[PDB]
Design a protein around this ligand. Structure first.
Ligand code: A1BNM
Length: 286
């Protein structure tokens, strides 16, 4: 009741803040060509995915007060497909961003040649295709169930096998592989930063490189912190059939809320970790 309305209020606050912040990030990235760097290309996709995953929160939150789904199965389809597209889009974007830094640092000669913004958009597109390859089935099997109590929105499968096959294809192809690629790149960029006195030659350029890479790593770590709980809980709850409990329900709600709040946390990180973003957030906001 009171607790439920506080949960709804928190979800509404997260919805508004995340949508506004991610819209602002997309606009600031699109505003100027000097802000169209390769890192900004992937930041654009990350913010786009966050905005898409946040736009459905009013529907996802109104349900707590009714136990019913009046919005429609089409909207149910879209919301359920968004919930899955978000994980793949964002993690793949971060993996591509962390791989790009390796080309920038350890192979600067070919870095500028292969990191054109057209190539960045191409690796954004490929991320989209690979995510769609496991996202489209979610929408194609997502439909509402006309329960006796109240209509509900849920997935369907033909259902103990594929329901877990999708979970494995997420935990493997969308968490562990991208994390393992990010680590494999960073473990070598970090050594190339120290073993090389100056990377880009120009001291200002080297400082900009070591700072943009730090922001990329910070965003990557923020995403990992925010999303590891939900992935791990999703895997474990199915693995050991954890039964219903007060602590279990609270932890589930907290994990989902943190995963959704990452979307509105990203704007804070961009504001607190980049001179360009910080200046623009006041420039367009005044
Ligand atoms: C508040 C509305 N709500 C959402 C849910 C469930 N969601 C949460 C977690 C999921 C998930 C995460 C990891 C692995 C996996 O296989 C599935 C979703 C795909 C994404 C949702 C989320 O939090 O990321 C924005 C979906 C099933 C239940 N209620």
């Amino acid at each position: 009741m009171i607790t439920a309305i506080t949960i709804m209020a928190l979800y509404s606050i997260v919805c508004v803040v995340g949508l506004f912040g991610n819209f602002l990030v997309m606009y600031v990235i699109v505003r100027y060509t000097k802000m169209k760097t390769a890192t900004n290309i992937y930041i654009f996709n990350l913010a786009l995915a966050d905005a898409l995953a946040t736009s459905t929160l009013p529907f996802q939150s109104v349900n707590y007060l009714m136990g019913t789904w009046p919005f429609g199965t089409i909207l149910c389809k879209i919301v359920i497909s968004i919930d899955y597209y978000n994980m793949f889009t964002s993690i793949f974007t971060l993996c591509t961003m962390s791989v790009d830094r390796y080309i920038a640092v350890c192979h600067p000669v070919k870095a500028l040649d292969f990191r054109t913004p057209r190539n960045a958009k191409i690796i954004n597109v490929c991320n989209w295709i690979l995510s769609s390859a496991i996202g489209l089935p979610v929408m194609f099997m997502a439909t509402t169930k006309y329960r006796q109590g109240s209509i509900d929105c849920t997935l369907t499968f033909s259902t103990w096998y594929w329901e877990n096959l999708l979970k494995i294809c997420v935990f493997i192809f969308a968490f562990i592989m991208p994390v393992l690629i990010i680590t494999v790149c960073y473990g070598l960029m970090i050594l190339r930063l120290k073993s090389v006195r100056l990377l880009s030659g120009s001291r200002e350029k080297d400082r900009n490189l070591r700072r943009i890479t730090r922001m990329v790593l910070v965003v990557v770590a923020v995403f990992i912190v925010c999303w590891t709980p939900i992935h791990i809980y999703v895997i474990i709850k199915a693995l050991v059939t954890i039964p219903e409990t007060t602590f279990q329900t609270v932890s589930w709600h907290f994990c989902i809320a943190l995963g959704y709040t990452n979307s509105c946390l990203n704007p804070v990180l961009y504001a607190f970790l980049d001179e360009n973003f910080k200046r623009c957030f006041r420039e367009f906001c005044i």
